[PDB]
Each structure stands twice: as C-alpha cells, then as structure tokens.
Amino acid sequence: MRVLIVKTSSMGDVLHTLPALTDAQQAIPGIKFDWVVEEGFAQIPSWHAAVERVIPVAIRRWRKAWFSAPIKAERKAFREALQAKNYDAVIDAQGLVKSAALVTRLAHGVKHGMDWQTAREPLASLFYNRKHHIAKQQHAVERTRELFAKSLGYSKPQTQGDYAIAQHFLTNLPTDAGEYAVFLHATTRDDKHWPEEHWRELIGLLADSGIRIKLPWGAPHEEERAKRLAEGFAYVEVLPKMSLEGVARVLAGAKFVVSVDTGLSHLTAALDRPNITVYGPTDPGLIGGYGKNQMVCRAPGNELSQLTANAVKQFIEENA
C-alpha cells in the first residue's frame, strides 16, 4: 500500500500530521507515504520512517510570476512528479480549495479528505472521492489521526499520538546533549514576542545554575535580537545559521525548551522535548502544542509584556 499525503503548509500543520503516519504504519505494515509539502518544510517528512517520496511545491512563490518560463518549468516538473505514481489512496489533510485544486485534483488515486461540514473551506470537499466527517472540536493531531484512520480502514488507537521523528536524530545527537536549553524567541507577530527585557531576566536567573543556553535565529533581525539576549552571559550562545534539520538536531539535544508560539515550538513538541510555550494574543487551547511534556504558560491579560521571567522560571521549576 502506497499513500499520497497533501499537507503543504504551516510548519506546525505539517508536524501535527506525523502522528497519523505512525498510526497507519503500525496498523498497516509495509505502508509507505509520499508527501506533497511546501519547499521550506520539505525536510520534515523525510524524518519519518514511513515516508518515501517528498514532493515539494512552492505555491506562494510561484504565485508571484505564475507564467514565467522559470516557474513554468518548476511547475511542469512538479506535476510530473505528482502524477508519476498511482496511489492506493490520496489523503488531503489540509482541506483548503487552493491545494485541493492544484495538488489533490491532479493525483492518481482515490482522494480522501474532510467533508463539507468539517473541511477548513467547505468547497474543498467537492474535490474528494471520499468525504469524511472529522469533528472540529479536538486537537489538529487527533483530527488528522481520525482522517487517516477513516481513509485507510483502521480504528484510531486510543494511545497518545507519536510523531516518531525523534529516532532520526538520536543516532547522531550533539555531543553536549542535555548540557543546554534552547530559547525560541523568534516568531512573526510583534505581540507574540516575549519582550527582550524579560528574556534576559530569565537568562539571568539561570546564571548560577550551570546550564548553557542556545539561541536559534532565522533572519538577520532575529540574529541581532539573539546577540542582544546573549550580551553579557558567558553561558549563552548564539547559534550559527542553519537548516530546519540542523536546528532540529539542536532541539533534539536540548534538556528543555522555553519558546513563543511558533513553528519551532511545534517541532520541539514533535521531538518530545520538554517545552514551556508562552502565549499572549494566541490561545493554546485552540492552537497549542501536542505532546505530554508540553507545558502551557499563559501571560497575564494575554499580554506577554505582563509575563515575568520570574513566573516563567517559577513555572519551569513547578513543571519539572
């Protein structure tokens, strides 16, 4: 059995899909998955043992000059890669018209997806051969598990979902694994950031613990912030620029993590690492992490400026 997955975007959404592949592999031995995913996250599916082919798309980038010869080429190579194999099942775990019309529609095989009532965009259901009813009021990880389960003919296990990507890194963990913690300070919205002042205070509180802290960064401004947070603390290091798989390895070796509501926080949960995610304008109950050792820390009045470094540590301490 070879199945095709359409779940391209939002690092988090991609990551939350992993537990479903694990259920499938355990219930259907020998099952392999191909995965159509946004180029920026293409490495994530390769970490799962049940994944074979990873087929990258770049919808947003392609949308800006859709008929240019350069893109036309990429798009042609994409469609050919997508239509190369004939699948026993195509599972659209995205439920958006855009990817359903551009990806799902073109795949060879019975197409499964969420029905009119439960798809993110109802009209997306019209593009599937099998429309499944997946209840909206449950975690995204569970919903996708239910989807894979109903699509492949097996009952969803009652055990907690297992991302099963950690194993990919445990074979080659950083030498200093467990000697440090990782602080994920970078995200996309101003109000989702925990004020720098507070990050430093938290860093400061750990000065005499003996722990080391590593700060990742994706873009120049983030590195600058990273340099400002480490300024003065010898036990704090600013990581070099690296790929997702690179920062994945570092996370895998972190004893624990403190982070803002962002994709890398979801990755950290996928690697089963203790993590304290701090929320402000976004709600964890709706968009929170999945994974057991995932600890939610709400800011007073949902305003991170009101979250003290003291409370975050007084949190890490009482969530040990």
Ligand SMILES: Nc1ncnc2c1ncn2[C@@H]1O[C@H](COP(=O)(O)OP(=O)(O)O)[C@@H](O)[C@H]1O
């Ligand atoms: N390889 C990387 N190393 C460090 N940070 C990264 C890397 N890739 C993405 N990011 C961070 O993820 C964020 C952008 O996307 P995402 O994580 O999904 O965030 P959000 O959920 O806030 O939209 C940025 O803050 C970006 O720097």
